mmCIF file of C-alpha atoms and ligand atoms in Angstrom:
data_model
loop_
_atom_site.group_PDB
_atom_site.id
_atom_site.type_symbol
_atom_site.label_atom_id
_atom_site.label_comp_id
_atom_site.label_asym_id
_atom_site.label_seq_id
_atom_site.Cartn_x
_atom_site.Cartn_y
_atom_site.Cartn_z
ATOM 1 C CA UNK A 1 -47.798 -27.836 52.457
ATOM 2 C CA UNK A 2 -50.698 -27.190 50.017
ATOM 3 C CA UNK A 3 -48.801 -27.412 46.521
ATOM 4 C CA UNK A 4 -50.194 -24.150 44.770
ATOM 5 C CA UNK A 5 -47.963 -21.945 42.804
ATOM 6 C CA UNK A 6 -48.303 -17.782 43.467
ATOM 7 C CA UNK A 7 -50.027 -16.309 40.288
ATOM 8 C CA UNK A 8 -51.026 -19.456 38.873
ATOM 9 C CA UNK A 9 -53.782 -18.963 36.487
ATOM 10 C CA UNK A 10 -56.671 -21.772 38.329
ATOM 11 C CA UNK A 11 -55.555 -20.317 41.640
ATOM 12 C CA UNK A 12 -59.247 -19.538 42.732
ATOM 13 C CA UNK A 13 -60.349 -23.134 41.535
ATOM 14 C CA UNK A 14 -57.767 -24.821 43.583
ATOM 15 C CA UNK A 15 -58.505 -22.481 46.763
ATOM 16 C CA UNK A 16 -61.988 -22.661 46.901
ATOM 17 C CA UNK A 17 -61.650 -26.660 48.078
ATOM 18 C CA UNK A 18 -59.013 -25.481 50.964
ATOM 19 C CA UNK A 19 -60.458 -25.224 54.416
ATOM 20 C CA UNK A 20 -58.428 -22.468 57.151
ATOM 21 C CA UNK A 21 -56.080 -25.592 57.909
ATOM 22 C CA UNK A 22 -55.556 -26.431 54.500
ATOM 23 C CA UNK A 23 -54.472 -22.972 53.749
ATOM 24 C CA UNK A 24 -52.474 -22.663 56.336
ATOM 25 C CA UNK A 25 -50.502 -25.302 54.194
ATOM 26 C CA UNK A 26 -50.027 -22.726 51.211
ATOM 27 C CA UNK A 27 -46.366 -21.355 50.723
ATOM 28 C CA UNK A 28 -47.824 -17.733 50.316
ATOM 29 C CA UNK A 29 -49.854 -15.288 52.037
ATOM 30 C CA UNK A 30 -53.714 -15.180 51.961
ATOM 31 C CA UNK A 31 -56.316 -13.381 52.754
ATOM 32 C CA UNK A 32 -59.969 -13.826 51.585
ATOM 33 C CA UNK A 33 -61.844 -10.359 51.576
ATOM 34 C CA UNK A 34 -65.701 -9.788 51.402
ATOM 35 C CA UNK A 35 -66.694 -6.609 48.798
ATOM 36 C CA UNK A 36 -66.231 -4.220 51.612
ATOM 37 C CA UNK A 37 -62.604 -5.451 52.422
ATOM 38 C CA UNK A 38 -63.697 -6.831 55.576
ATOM 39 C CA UNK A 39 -61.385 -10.171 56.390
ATOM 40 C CA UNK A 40 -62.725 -13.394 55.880
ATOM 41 C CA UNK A 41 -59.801 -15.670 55.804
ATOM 42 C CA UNK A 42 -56.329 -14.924 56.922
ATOM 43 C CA UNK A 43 -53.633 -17.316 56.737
ATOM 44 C CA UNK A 44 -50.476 -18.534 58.662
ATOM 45 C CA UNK A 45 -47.771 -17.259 56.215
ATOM 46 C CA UNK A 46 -49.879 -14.240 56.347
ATOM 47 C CA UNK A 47 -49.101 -13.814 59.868
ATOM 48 C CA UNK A 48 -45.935 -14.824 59.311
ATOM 49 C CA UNK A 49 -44.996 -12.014 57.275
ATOM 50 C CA UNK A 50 -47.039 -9.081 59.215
ATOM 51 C CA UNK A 51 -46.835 -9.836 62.471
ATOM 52 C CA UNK A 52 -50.907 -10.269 62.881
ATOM 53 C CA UNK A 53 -52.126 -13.141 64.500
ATOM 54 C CA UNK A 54 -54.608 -14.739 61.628
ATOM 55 C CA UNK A 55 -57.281 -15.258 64.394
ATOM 56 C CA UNK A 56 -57.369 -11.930 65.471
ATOM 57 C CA UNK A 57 -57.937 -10.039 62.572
ATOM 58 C CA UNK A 58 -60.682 -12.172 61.132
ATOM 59 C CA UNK A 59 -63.959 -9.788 60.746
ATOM 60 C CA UNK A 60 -61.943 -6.624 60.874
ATOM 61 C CA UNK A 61 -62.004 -4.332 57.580
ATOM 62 C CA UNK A 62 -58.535 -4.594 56.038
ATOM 63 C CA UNK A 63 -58.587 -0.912 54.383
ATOM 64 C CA UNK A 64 -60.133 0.638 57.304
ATOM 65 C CA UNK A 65 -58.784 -1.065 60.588
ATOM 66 C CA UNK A 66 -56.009 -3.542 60.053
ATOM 67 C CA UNK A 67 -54.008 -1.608 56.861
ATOM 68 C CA UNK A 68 -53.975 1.575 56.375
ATOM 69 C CA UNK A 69 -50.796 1.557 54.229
ATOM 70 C CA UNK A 70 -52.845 -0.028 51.296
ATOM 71 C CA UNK A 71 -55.856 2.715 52.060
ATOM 72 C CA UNK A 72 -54.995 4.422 48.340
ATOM 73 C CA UNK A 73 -55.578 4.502 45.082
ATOM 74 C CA UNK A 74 -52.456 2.425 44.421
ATOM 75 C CA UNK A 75 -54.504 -0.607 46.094
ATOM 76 C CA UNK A 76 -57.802 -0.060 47.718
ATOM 77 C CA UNK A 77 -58.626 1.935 44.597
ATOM 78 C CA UNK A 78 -57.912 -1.115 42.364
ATOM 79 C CA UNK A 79 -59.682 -3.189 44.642
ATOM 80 C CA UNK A 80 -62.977 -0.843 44.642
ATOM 81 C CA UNK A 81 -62.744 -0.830 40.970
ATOM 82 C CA UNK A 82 -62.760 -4.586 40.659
ATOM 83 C CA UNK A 83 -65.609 -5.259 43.105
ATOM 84 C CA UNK A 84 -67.415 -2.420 41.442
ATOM 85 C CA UNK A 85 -66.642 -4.245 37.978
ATOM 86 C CA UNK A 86 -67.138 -7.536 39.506
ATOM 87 C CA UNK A 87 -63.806 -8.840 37.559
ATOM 88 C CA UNK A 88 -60.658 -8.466 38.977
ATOM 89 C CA UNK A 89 -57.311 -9.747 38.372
ATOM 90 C CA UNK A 90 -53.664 -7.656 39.461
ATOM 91 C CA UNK A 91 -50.420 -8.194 40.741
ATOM 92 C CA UNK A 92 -47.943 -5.502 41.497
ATOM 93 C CA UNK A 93 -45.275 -4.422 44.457
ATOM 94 C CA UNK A 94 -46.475 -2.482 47.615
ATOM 95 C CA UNK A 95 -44.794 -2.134 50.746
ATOM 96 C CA UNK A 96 -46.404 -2.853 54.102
ATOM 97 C CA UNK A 97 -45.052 -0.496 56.853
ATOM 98 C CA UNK A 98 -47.654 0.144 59.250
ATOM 99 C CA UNK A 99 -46.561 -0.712 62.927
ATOM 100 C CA UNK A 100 -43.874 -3.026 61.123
ATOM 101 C CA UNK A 101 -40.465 -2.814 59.632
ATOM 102 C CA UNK A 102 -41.119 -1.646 56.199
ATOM 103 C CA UNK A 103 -41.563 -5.037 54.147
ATOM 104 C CA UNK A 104 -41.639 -4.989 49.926
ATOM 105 C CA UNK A 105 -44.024 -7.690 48.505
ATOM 106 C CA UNK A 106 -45.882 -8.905 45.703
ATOM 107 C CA UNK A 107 -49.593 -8.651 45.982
ATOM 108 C CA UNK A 108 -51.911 -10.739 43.685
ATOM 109 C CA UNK A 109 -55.190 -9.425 43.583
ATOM 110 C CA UNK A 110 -58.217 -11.477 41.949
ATOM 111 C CA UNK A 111 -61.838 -12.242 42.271
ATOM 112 C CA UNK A 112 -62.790 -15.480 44.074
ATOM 113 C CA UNK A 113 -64.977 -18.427 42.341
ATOM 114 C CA UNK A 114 -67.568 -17.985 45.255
ATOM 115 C CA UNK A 115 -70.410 -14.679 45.496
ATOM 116 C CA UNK A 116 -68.981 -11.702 46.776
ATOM 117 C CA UNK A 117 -65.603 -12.802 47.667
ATOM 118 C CA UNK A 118 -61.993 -11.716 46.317
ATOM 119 C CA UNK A 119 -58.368 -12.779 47.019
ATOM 120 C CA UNK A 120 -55.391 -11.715 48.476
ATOM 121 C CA UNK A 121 -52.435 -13.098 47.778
ATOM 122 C CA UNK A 122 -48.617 -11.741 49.017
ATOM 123 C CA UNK A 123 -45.052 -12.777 48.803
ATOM 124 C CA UNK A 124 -41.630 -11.477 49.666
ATOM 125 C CA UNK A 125 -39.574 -10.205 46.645
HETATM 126 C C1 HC4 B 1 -50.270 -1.448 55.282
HETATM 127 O O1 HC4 B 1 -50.851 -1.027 56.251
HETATM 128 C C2 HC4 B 1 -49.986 -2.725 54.728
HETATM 129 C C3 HC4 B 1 -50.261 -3.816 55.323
HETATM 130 C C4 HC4 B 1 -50.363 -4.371 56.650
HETATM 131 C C5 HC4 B 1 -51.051 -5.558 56.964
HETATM 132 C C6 HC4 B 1 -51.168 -6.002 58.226
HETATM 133 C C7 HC4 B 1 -50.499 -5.349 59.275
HETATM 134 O O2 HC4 B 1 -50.502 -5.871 60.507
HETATM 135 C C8 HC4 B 1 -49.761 -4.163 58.939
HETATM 136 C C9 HC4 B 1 -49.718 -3.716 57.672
#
């Protein structure tokens, strides 16, 4: 267990030292997207909580392929708007229901350290 808390404010300093193991430690869901919201990084509480296994979904686009449920202005459009502005930072409740039961969460968006790289970060609530 990788002791980061969810929405803390150096959350992309202390990630950007984590390898895929080390994340895998982390006692939230993440998911490292490139600017077109194909899937970089995916980790085990992620799978944990949507069913996906991490290693399969790495490369896929998460808008297009592996989430349709977030394909709206609600997220994707917030997430377009922030690679388009190169800043991002958001957190708000969604509710992933595609091909699972319907699950609320809290999703923390924000821009990673690193080039062309931005964060997802989810919880139960
Ligand atoms: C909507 O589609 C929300 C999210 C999501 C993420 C992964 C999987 O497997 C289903 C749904």
């Amino acid at each position: 267990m990788e002791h980061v808390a969810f929405g803390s404010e150096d959350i992309e300093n202390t990630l950007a030292k984590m390898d895929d193991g080390q994340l895998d430690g982390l006692a939230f869901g993440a998911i490292q997207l490139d600017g077109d919201g194909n899937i970089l990084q995916y980790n085990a509480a992620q799978g944990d909580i949507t069913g996906r296994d991490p290693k399969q979904v790495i490369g896929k686009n998460f808008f297009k392929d592996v989430a349709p449920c977030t394909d709206s202005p609600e997220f994707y459009g917030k997430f377009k708007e922030g690679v388009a502005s190169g800043n991002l930072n958001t957190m708000f409740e969604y509710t992933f229901d595609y091909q699972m039961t319907p699950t609320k969460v809290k999703v923390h968006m924000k821009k990673a350290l690193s080039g062309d790289s931005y964060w997802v970060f989810v919880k139960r609530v």
